Amino acid sequence: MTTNYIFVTGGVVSSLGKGIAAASLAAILEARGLNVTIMKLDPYINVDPGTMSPIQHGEVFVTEDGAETDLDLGHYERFIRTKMSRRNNFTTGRIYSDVLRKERRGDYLGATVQVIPHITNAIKERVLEGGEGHDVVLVEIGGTVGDIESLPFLEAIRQMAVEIGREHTLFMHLTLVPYMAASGEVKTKPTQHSVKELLSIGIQPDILICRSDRAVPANERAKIALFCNVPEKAVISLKDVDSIYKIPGLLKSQGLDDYICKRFSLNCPEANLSEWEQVIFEEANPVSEVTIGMVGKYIELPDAYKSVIEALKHGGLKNRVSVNIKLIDSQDVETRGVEILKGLDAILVPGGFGYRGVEGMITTARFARENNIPYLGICLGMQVALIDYARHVANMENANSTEFVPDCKYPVVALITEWRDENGNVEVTMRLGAQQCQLVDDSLVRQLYNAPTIVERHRHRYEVNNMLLKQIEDAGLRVAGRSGDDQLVEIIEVPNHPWFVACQFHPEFTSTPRDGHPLFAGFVKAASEFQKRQA
Amino acid sequence: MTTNYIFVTGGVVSSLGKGIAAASLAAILEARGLNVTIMKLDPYINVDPGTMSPIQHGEVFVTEDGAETDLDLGHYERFIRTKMSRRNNFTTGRIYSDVLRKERRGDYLGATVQVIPHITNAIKERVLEGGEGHDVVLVEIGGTVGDIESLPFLEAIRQMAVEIGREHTLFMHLTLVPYMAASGEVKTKPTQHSVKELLSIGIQPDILICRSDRAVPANERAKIALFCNVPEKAVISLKDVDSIYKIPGLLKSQGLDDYICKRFSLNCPEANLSEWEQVIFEEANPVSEVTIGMVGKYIELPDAYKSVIEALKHGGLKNRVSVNIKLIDSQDVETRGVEILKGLDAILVPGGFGYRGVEGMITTARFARENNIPYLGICLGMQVALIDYARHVANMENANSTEFVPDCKYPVVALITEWRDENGNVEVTMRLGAQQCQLVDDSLVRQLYNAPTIVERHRHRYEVNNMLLKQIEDAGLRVAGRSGDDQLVEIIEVPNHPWFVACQFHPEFTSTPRDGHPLFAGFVKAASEFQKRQA
Amino acid sequence: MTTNYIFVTGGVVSSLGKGIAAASLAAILEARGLNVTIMKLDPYINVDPGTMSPIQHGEVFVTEDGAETDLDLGHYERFIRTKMSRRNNFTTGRIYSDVLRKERRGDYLGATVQVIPHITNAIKERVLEGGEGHDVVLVEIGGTVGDIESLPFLEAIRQMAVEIGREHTLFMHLTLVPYMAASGEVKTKPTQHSVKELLSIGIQPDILICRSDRAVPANERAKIALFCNVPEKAVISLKDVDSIYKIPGLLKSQGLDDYICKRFSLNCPEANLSEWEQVIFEEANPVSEVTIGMVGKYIELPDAYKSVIEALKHGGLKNRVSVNIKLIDSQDVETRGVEILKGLDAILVPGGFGYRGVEGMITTARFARENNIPYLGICLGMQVALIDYARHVANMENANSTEFVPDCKYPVVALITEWRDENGNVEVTMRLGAQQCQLVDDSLVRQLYNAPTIVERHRHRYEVNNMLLKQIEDAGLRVAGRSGDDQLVEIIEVPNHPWFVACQFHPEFTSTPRDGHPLFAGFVKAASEFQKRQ
């Protein structure tokens, strides 16, 4: 059929939750049997989030094909079944980098390359590439309407609406309707000025999503409906909610999907939100609760562990366990000591880069292993576990990673190019994306995944030194998973411990609220068993 | 002292002559003993005009250091003594290319690169680099105020005005004051809306340069003065003129330089425009007139030969000769024949690339040589002269250039890598910028330049094949100039002809109206001698 | 029958000619059998042009019902048959005067009166009032888009477009496309910025009228067409012309009327512009030429005599005569003398108010009566003719009007309440609009009109003193027209003269290029015969 497009923009302020709204609406349309997809347009000059620090942009989400993207794609995969790829997230820097490469190559035939139409042509080509092949395509424009940085994005999508037509395009505008105490009522004036910004660039909104700390009354929605020349049913109230999994139900309660299916002339059955109602049911009726400590180095911005924090909540839904996540600075463990790690039913060390705070994570891993506290290490959290076991069990003095101490005697973690031993003898590139992993029989993860092979996503450089691995294995450490040709260690386990698993890949990128994740489900389940054993 | 900046912008329309106004004002300030310089900001995505076709952007001006720049720098060097370089002209594509390279290198330290401040910081760094070291710096912003493409340029210079202060910065805004027949008066309303555009981005004009097909009356300047909150003496009338060399006198007659020197607290004597009054004197009182035919391939846009056409007028000033330049399509010579080249006192073949129309230039060179018509070839015009002489005198059948016929038997013009002969035997990279050339004694150019060595600017790839040169020399052709180590032929001359000179470099880039050029002066002088010999 | 609306605005500059383009477009639709009407929305604070000076704003047009309106209603009546009224022109001052009246009256029930919606509703009420009853209604908005003085007008008609819908509303935008000599081409950038201003206030154009000193090439129109997201048929080129009577044909040749009939779903035959083609042919092929001097006091602004100058040209179309109008300051006749009136085939003294320059008009009328030069006096031009005849034929020393000399012995012109005589004895207030007039048999105007009664429009206060009239009638003067019950003198004629007529009404408000006017046709015809005799 004909591909339909829903352009999503926001005004007044920036942190309106544009991606959450687009993902929630896409879950409704998908629930009606429609083939839906989402993409994100960022107005940054960075070519991709690969260079951005975690404390600035958030987590670096990794798709299946190995693309480093904005974390909004994690929201997309946690709401709809469609798998994101590189074509679902591009930036202004990517556009200019592509146009500049075509010009120097001479593909513009000596013409003068301009913002209009050449930059806008490059944007339309990418929006079409990621969209064509689906029924409805949701395009989220980053930034606030009225700023310089998103003007090429808005002018580009305006040309698509003209060329495609109003029977297959919709402009959905999020706006802020703030409440004033001195007025006792929410205020529509910021929406008035924001919609006037869209008109001055040739965009007429079709749907207004009103964001506020409370429901926007029907009287105030009527003023917005008349000022914007849209039907009253096209003005939706989106109040602040405690759980984002309720937002799909809120939009359907106001007929947002019925208005979109009508405008696009799509004949599809009513949405069946039973799976989202079940997710809300499990979250609202827990049996017990636990406290899991997440010891990392980017705690100053909790969004640096977005998918990890969300996957922990998913492990609680499947076990009916309420999870209280306690962010603990690993550098505080370096100075104040282990005393800060008391009162935890489980310990998780997420990934990261840089030596700052690593020794605090190595001390944290030793504390969880010796005191039989359920432990889950991811990427860097696996390295600090291998370093702890090699030092304090295998008696490898000052064993470390070449990333932190290049001239160490026992480089248990190093690049494949650097593999050596304690004598210096040798043998005779960022890994990104999904890769198959072979699980070892009689291992804990072989039972959790209930499969001989699995597929997880990577983002790391330094690997386990296979030259020093067999000595650590003789000390009791277990290898639970290998991958590829070089038999690189992917998962390690410590027997004689209630639950101690560490993996090289990032399992949080495959966890969803409706399906959970086998690793996090067993990790949270072991946390409640540890808590109950403290009668 | 402290560097002062004059930002030059334009509104209403694009073809206001912003560069002509900035260059004319810089000639006045320089005439007062001030160290002045100019720079041009282009909002194109091209990294430099090196890829733009001549029929689209105009001529590709070449500075001394070898930079391919916008032709507005030709206006700069023809008005002030300061020599332009690469730092006097950059584009939006250059800015983004520099910022993108810094990001991938990691110089931004994992931060999020944004339009503000990172793109605006990159613009301010370049404006300061080309300016610091001078008293007054004129910064011309391309495009029309109110468009998307020049918004980063305007926001960047607005931050410089705040940081530097209003005692060392001035905003000069060119505007259109059109005349309406039904109103019998010029209209100030387009200026009203244009100045409102500047206010909405944080810029208040200090000087209004009113462009119109007639002088803007003092009554209409008063309305503009009040609407813009500027003194009446800051509203200048710039009517359409027959000669751009009169514009320096028009601006000084209205005290534009006195207002700038006062605002900047510069104590300097009154401008002495005697050299510009002398240039206007020579142009207005010619003795005879001639008609010179310029046979090229980019005639559809006369700006493709901007500096060449201007240097021909400079040769007439020094000889008191009025020059009627007749643009003749070389491709018309291919089909209609030589009959179109009748009635010319001189023939000039300028540079170019591509085989289209080259055979018409080869026929044109043969016509000028056989009929004793003064001929001047530049770059490509020199190649077609060498091809003509090798074919029709040296009897080298189908002699050509490898740029046009790669497998020709006599590649008299080819890359140094391709140098071969008629038997195929061999011997045992764009040239850009100024290079020294050694003139041969008893040659025509040795007397015109009156020097053993000269310096001219290059822009070409294909050179004279030194393997086939000595056979052409035996046929009568003369080598007048060589350069560098490889003794590459720079100038050729045909004896037994009143005036026949062809050079590889572009001499039009060094010609000015106040100083002329020795080559063009002798070329135009020989044209009037040919015209007089037709009694 | 659903009434359609065509909103007409303009940008870049003010002097685009919005009214002429609206009247020309209305002439095409009317030529197809449609009932059309035009409106004018002025953003001035003046309640009506009655207070505005002639030398500053132009002529004060008078409709049939007696309304003092902008002169653009003169262009309207000269292009379509529909008669204008008070409902076809209102200003911002009128809107605020209405709203303030309803407020103190208590019609707003103690509510807070605001610009939106109260001021905008008052505008929409008046646009509907003048529009309903027709097929197509053209509403011209004064001012330039982007200025603040016309923002309520633009928001009001924007609300009407939503209520009515795009099936019965159109936005036609006039814009300037200037030519640059340094570029050798016209520039569309001002149109870009002006259209963006329209979008900022919620208006999207449907038709673009490109004004320039030359035809806008099809390449530049296609660039404007896609920038505004309109079909290339909706971008019309309207170059500068030598005669406004060519504009209806120029718009039809580009299919502007067909696009409007299509958008409004109207099925009507092709426009028949045979009358306008005849007007263009007559103007382009004159046989002889005359020079008619217009001696007045408002020559400082030519627009002060807009309909008079236009009616003189219509008198030349009916006679195939090229009329070369020469504006002469009557105050110059006072100082330089009669020598200024030399070399004129006819003399016209228009109307006005104030004693300044009147004595020069009295001298001018005497020069035409004594030298047998065709003369036409309108309103004040009739007073100076009566004053001249009373002084130099009836021997009434210093005969004058009480408007100028209140205590003159012979007040031949005075208010009806002031009527006295030379001894002081007495007998036992604006006139505006159309009033029937009775013509006297065996008179000149009786023949020209070919009717016993006529209807013309008035604008004056001072009448002919009927107490002193019989003495002037005995001296030779003849009364050719009377009106009403008081038998007020409307037309006077001087016998033993080739062509000497003076009337109190304003006949120029009835003249059209297609029908002319009996008075002006005979006036210019007399000038041609006078020119042949010299």
Ligand SMILES: Nc1ccn([C@@H]2O[C@H](COP(=O)(O)OP(=O)(O)OP(=O)(O)O)[C@@H](O)[C@H]2O)c(=O)n1
């Ligand atoms: N006139 C402007 C001003 C700023 N920017 C952009 O605005 C972005 C900042 O967005 P935001 O997250 O809202 O940060 P703040 O401007 O600080 O807004 P707030 O204080 O509400 O957080 C920057 O990327 C900058 O490029 C822009 O495009 N146009």
Ligand SMILES: Nc1ccn([C@@H]2O[C@H](COP(=O)(O)OP(=O)(O)OP(=O)(O)O)[C@@H](O)[C@H]2O)c(=O)n1
């Ligand atoms: N484009 C507009 C629209 C509205 N108004 C004015 O704005 C005023 C409304 O004041 P306000 O108290 O802000 O009304 P609301 O728009 O309803 O404010 P809010 O809903 O945010 O409480 C009205 O008098 C109206 O004249 C205006 O001048 N410009």
Ligand SMILES: Nc1ccn([C@@H]2O[C@H](COP(=O)(O)OP(=O)(O)OP(=O)(O)O)[C@@H](O)[C@H]2O)c(=O)n1
């Ligand atoms: N920001 C402004 C400034 C002016 N005006 C209005 O614009 C009108 C002026 O009309 P115009 O004939 O265009 O005057 P000028 O500005 O002098 O036009 P121009 O000089 O171009 O001939 C005035 O009535 C004034 O109320 C306005 O509404 N908005």
Ligand SMILES: Nc1ccn([C@@H]2O[C@H](COP(=O)(O)OP(=O)(O)OP(=O)(O)O)[C@@H](O)[C@H]2O)c(=O)n1
């Ligand atoms: N809203 C817009 C529209 C266009 N552009 C820029 O405007 C430039 C075109 O400039 P100009 O030389 O004036 O061409 P035209 O738009 O065609 O203007 P005109 O018709 O007057 O020649 C293009 O580079 C384009 O990037 C822009 O920045 N903002």
